[PDB]
A = this chain, B = another copy of it.
Amino acid sequence: FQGAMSSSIDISKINSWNKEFQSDLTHQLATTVLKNYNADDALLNKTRLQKQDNRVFNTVVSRCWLFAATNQLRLNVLSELNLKEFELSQAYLFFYDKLEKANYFLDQIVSSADQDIDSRLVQYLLAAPTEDGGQYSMFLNLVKKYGLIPKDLYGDLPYSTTASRKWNSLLTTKLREFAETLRTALKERSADDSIIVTLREQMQREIFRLMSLFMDIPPVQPNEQFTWEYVDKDKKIHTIKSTPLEFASKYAKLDPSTPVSLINDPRHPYGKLIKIDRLGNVLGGDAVIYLNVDNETLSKLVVKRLQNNKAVFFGSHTPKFMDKKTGVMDIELWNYPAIGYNLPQQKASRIRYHESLMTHAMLITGCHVDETSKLPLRYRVENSWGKDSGKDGLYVMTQKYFEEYCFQIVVDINELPKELASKFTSGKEEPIVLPIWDPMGALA
């Protein structure tokens, strides 16, 4: 009884505390202002903004996850064909990513059919099976099977390509129906039973049928040739005949063997591979695997990749401490300490306690290294939100933001020091395996 009483909200206490807080001048100012405006708008610190909004960078390159993953490849074609402007088709990868995830889910349901419907995994599988977000391994899974094509051949014409929510909800309701049909059939039968095999094919058919109402299947198969007419930056006209698979290697120069993801996940020891269980899109494709490293190592890899003249795919917790209007990512940009609001929970604990996670993929296209003999101070970041977000879509991010609210970067294995590259090439590493619902997961 005494414990419960002490644990209750006591009216005398809150009113006495209220009297104490209202005797403080800062508190009085604070409640006046904060009953009038959103705390981020009221506390944005322009004195700090003046110092941090610095767009000078001494080290620059010369569905967001899809735009970020394909940007380099896009530049490779631009360069390879002497083009003024060029865009790879994101819709192409989007259509196959969704079809594959829908198909992957059916297999995830068959393999978890031994668990109760209300189990943690099965409920999780049912929550959002056809969401739009992905990881870099999911992107490579798609390019290896489907290749790439110019946007001119398959653009963002359909309603659902830019407003996918209604389409996903219709597919998802059907998939939830299907899960029950499959689990119900599996009680009587074995999964390799011909009735189950047939049932599953009919579901694939139905998923595809429904998908084709909202987006057309791409115009050519992966090993099928398309013809593409374009104009180079000189006004000259040309025609390329190629297949999507050949286009991705011969013109976009993608070598799927080189990209590797490093991550700063302080919940775990550095030097270990981390694998997210079940997270995937193409049945039988590669897993989401990251090599855990410290931030110093992570920052150095970014700088080195930029020196090779290549942007850097990275995942972070958008929009934590991100000011969209000014395009600044700085954890001290808002004056929360002036209202006594401080946040001591550290990165590992923020991840474990449901406070921070990867939510969004972007590109680091430059950085500023302290001119003397030091390290990076701020990075230039680019998004796929139109030139009207940030500064023409351009953001500046502090070294401290990168350390605290960024996690993953992707680089080519040859840019890694031998001791790290071998973690991927030796076959000796046993990864730390995390649940499918881990915070270090898919990116929008």
- Tell whether A43 is near chain B: CB-to-CB under 8 Å: yes
Contact A32 B15 (CB under 8 A): no
Contact flag A216-B31 (CB < 8 Å), given A170-B341, A177-B344: yes
Contact A180 B349 (CB under 8 A): yes
Contact A29 B209 (CB under 8 A): no
Contact flag A39-B167 (CB < 8 Å), given A33-B33, A127-B354, A208-B14: yes
- By beta carbon, the residue of chain B nearest A219 is B50
Contact A352 B155 (CB under 8 A): no
Contact flag A32-B45 (CB < 8 Å), given A38-B159, A197-B6, A355-B176: yes
Measured CB to CB, the closest approach of chain B to A92, in angstroms, equals 12
Decide if the interface of chain A is mainly helix, strand, loop or mixed. Answer: helix
Task: Point out the residues of chain B lying under 8 angstroms from A100, CB to CB.
Answer: 9
Stretch at the interface among A198-206, A291-299, A301-309: A198-206
- By beta carbon, the residue of chain B nearest A10 is B204
- Tell whether A47 is near chain B: CB-to-CB under 8 Å: yes
Contact flag A7-B42 (CB < 8 Å), given A31-B47, A345-B180: no
Task: Point out the residues of chain B lying under 8 angstroms from A3, CB to CB.
Answer: 191-192, 197
Contact B32 A36 (CB under 8 A): no
Contact flag A35-B13 (CB < 8 Å), given A8-B284, A231-B56, A345-B176: no
Measured CB to CB, the closest approach of chain B to A29, in angstroms, equals 4
Stretch at the interface among A18-26, A78-86, A246-254, A392-400: A18-26
A110 to B213, CA, bound (A): 51
Measured CB to CB, the closest approach of chain B to A437, in angstroms, equals 8
Task: Point out the residues of chain B lying under 8 angstroms from A107, CB to CB.
Answer: 7
A159 to B282, CA, bound (A): 46
Stretch at the interface among A116-124, A132-140, A379-387, A410-418: A116-124
Task: Point out the residues of chain B lying under 8 angstroms from A340, CB to CB.
Answer: 209
Contact B35 A157 (CB under 8 A): yes
Number of A residues whose C-beta is below 8 Å from B? 113
Measured CB to CB, the closest approach of chain B to A38, in angstroms, equals 5
Contact B21 A212 (CB under 8 A): yes
Report A174-201 residues with CB < 8 Å from chain B CB.
174, 176-177, 179-180, 191-192, 197, 200-201
Contact B217 A56 (CB under 8 A): no
Q: Looking at the complex, which one of B170, B283, B339 makes contact with A29 (CB distance below 8 Å)?
A: B339
Task: Point out the residues of chain B lying under 8 angstroms from A160, CB to CB.
Answer: 34-35
Contact B345 A177 (CB under 8 A): yes
Contact flag A28-B283 (CB < 8 Å), given A177-B345, A216-B47: no
Task: Point out the residues of chain B lying under 8 angstroms from A421, CB to CB.
Answer: none
- Tell whether A72 is near chain B: CB-to-CB under 8 Å: no
Contact B31 A177 (CB under 8 A): no
Q: Looking at the complex, which one of B39, B44, B283, B353 makes contact with A4 (CB distance below 8 Å)?
A: B283
Q: Looking at the complex, which one of B36, B191, B213, B215 makes contact with A44 (CB distance below 8 Å)?
A: B36
Task: Point out the residues of chain B lying under 8 angstroms from A37, CB to CB.
Answer: 37, 41-42, 159
Measured CB to CB, the closest approach of chain B to A335, in angstroms, equals 4
Task: Point out the residues of chain B lying under 8 angstroms from A54, CB to CB.
Answer: 229
Measured CB to CB, the closest approach of chain B to A287, in angstroms, equals 15
- By beta carbon, the residue of chain B nearest A435 is B118
Apart from A31-B213, A31-B214, A32-B47: 20 A-B pairs, beta carbons within 8 A: A17-B209, A27-B213, A30-B213, A31-B212, A32-B335, A35-B47, A37-B159, A38-B163, A40-B166, A46-B216, A50-B153, A50-B155, A56-B229, A117-B353, A127-B354, A170-B341, A176-B350, A176-B353, A176-B354, A180-B349
29 CB contacts below 8 A, A to B, read A3-B192, A7-B103, A9-B100, A11-B222, A17-B205, A17-B208, A27-B209, A31-B214, A31-B216, A32-B42, A32-B44, A33-B43, A34-B214, A35-B216, A39-B166, A39-B214, A46-B158, A50-B219, A58-B237, A117-B353, A118-B435, A173-B343, A174-B341, A174-B343, A176-B354, A176-B355, A177-B355, A180-B353, A213-B339
